[PDB]
């Protein structure tokens, strides 16, 4: 499957793509404002994610740091990124269908649209100004809007037991972005697409 990753933000981002235990394609790349990077993701990939990273520095060997979404200091991510990270999430070719969503469970850094480029389903978007409107207690001094699990490490925010409800913090993310997951047990906003669809992830779509 192809994923065209497009940076419509006015600032550079470093895109990242991983399934947690391995890179997808090269795993990451710099995207200046307006640049597009097309990756290939193996069919059957389960639990893949794409995200933006901001305010990064890398040496010539591809080692460094980002202020949001850093994946072990690598340009080419092999693992998931450090919150806050708006997440484009997907599982491909799962019994004949693909499944896509956007999640704010690991916080929010950059607005994104995640849409098919092929027929048969709709896209999802979280493009509101979550960082600007972020509750004081969730603001990440490094940049972005943290989720409450990250900040407070409770059973209720992290849904550790599997019994949790919505919270005043999850409801903030849900208000700003109804079509993204706001906590682990949120009413799903997953879209079913045809198996082997292709996609575009756009940072700062609006």
**Cα torsion angle, 153, 159, 162, 167, sign:** positive
d(CA 92, CA 105): 21
Give the burial class of 134: count Cβ atoms within 10 A of its Cβ; 0-12 exposed, 13-18 middle, 19 or more buried: buried
d(CA 103, CA 107): 8
Cis peptide before 95 (omega within 30 of 0): no
Which of 95, 120, 104, 129 shows the shortest CA–CA distance to 49? 104
- If residue 48 lies in a helix (H) or strand (E), which one and from where to where? strand 48-58
Alpha helices in the chain (DSSP H): 130-133, 148-152, 155-158, 168-176
Q: Which residues contact 133 (CB under 8 A, 6 or more apart)?
A: 172, 176
Yes or no: say if 102 and 87 are a contact pair by the CB < 8 Å rule: yes
d(CA 54, CA 170): 23
**Cα torsion angle, 86, 91, 92, 98, sign:** negative
Which of 172, 23, 14 shows the shortest CA–CA distance to 107? 172
Q: Which residues contact 191 (CB under 8 A, 6 or more apart)?
A: 99, 100, 101, 121, 122, 123, 124
Query: For residue 162, what is the DSSP state?
Result: S
d(CA 49, CA 100): 10
Task: Report the domain count for the chain.
Answer: 1
Return contacts of 157-166, CB within 8 angstroms, 24+ apart: 157/183, 158/184, 159/183, 159/184, 159/185
Which of 112, 83, 65, 88 shows the shortest CA–CA distance to 18? 88
Method of elucidation? X-ray
Rg, Å, the chain Cα set: 16
d(CA 86, CA 69): 9
CATH number reported for the structural domain that contains residue 196 in this entry: 2.60.110.10
Range of the domain at 204: 1-206
3-state SS string over 115-134?
EECCCCCCCEEECCCHHHHC
Which of 124, 125, 137 shows the shortest CA–CA distance to 172? 137
- If residue 108 lies in a helix (H) or strand (E), which one and from where to where? none
- Give me the residues paired with residue 13 across strands: 31
Which of 93, 192, 85 shows the shortest CA–CA distance to 147? 85
Q: In the structure encoding, which two tokens stand for residue 160, read together?
A: 């550790």
Ordered strands of the 199-203 beta sheet? 36-40, 2-7, 199-203, 112-116, 124-126
């Amino acid at each position: 499957a192809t994923f065209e990753i497009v940076n419509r933000c006015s600032y550079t981002v470093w895109a990242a793509a991983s399934k947690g235990d391995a890179a997808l394609d090269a795993g990451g790349r710099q995207l200046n404002s307006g640049e597009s990077w097309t990756i290939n993701v193996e069919p059957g990939t389960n639990g893949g994610k794409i995200w933006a990273r901001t305010d990064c520095y890398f040496d010539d060997s591809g080692s460094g740091i980002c202020k949001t979404g850093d994946c072990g200091g690598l340009l080419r991510c092999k693992r998931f990124g450090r919150p806050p990270t708006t997440l484009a999430e997907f599982s491909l070719n799962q019994y004949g269908k693909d499944y896509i969503d956007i999640s704010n469970i690991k916080g929010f850094n950059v607005p994104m649209n995640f849409s098919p480029t092929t027929r048969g389903c709709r896209g999802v978007r979280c493009a509101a100004d979550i960082v600007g409107q972020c509750p004081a207690k969730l603001k990440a001094p490094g940049g972005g809007c943290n989720d409450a699990c990250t900040v407070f490490q409770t059973s209720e925010y992290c849904c550790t037991t599997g019994k949790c409800g919505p919270t005043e913090y999850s409801r903030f993310f849900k208000r700003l972005c109804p079509d993204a997951f706001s906590y682990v047990l949120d009413k799903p906003t997953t879209v079913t697409c045809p198996g082997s669809s292709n996609y575009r992830v756009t940072f700062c779509p609006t």
